[PDB]
Amino acid sequence: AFLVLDRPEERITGINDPRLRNPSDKFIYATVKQSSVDIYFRRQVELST
């Protein structure tokens, strides 16, 4: 049981993750400045936060 039930996991699940959607100061995420990723998040108002 100990050797099968060893699952740290707790890994981000896509962009709809609550950690990304409602970020805390502890969790830090970013992309590269002035690229398609920047003007993807900037374009969508639902991704303003």
Binding site: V45, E46, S48, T49
Partner: protein, 37 residues
């Protein structure tokens, strides 16, 4: 019509945030609110 609505900061239901330091107004996906002292 125009009427005054009270609100209390609590939980996901009400989250109170400061205005943008540069613009000085509320951002998108947000509505302005007041506060006394």
């Amino acid at each position: 019509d125009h009427l005054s609505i009270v609100t209390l900061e609590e939980a996901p239901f009400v989250i109170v945030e400061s205005v943008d330091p540069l613009s000085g107004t509320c951002m998108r996906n947000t509505v302005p609110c007041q506060k006394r002292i």
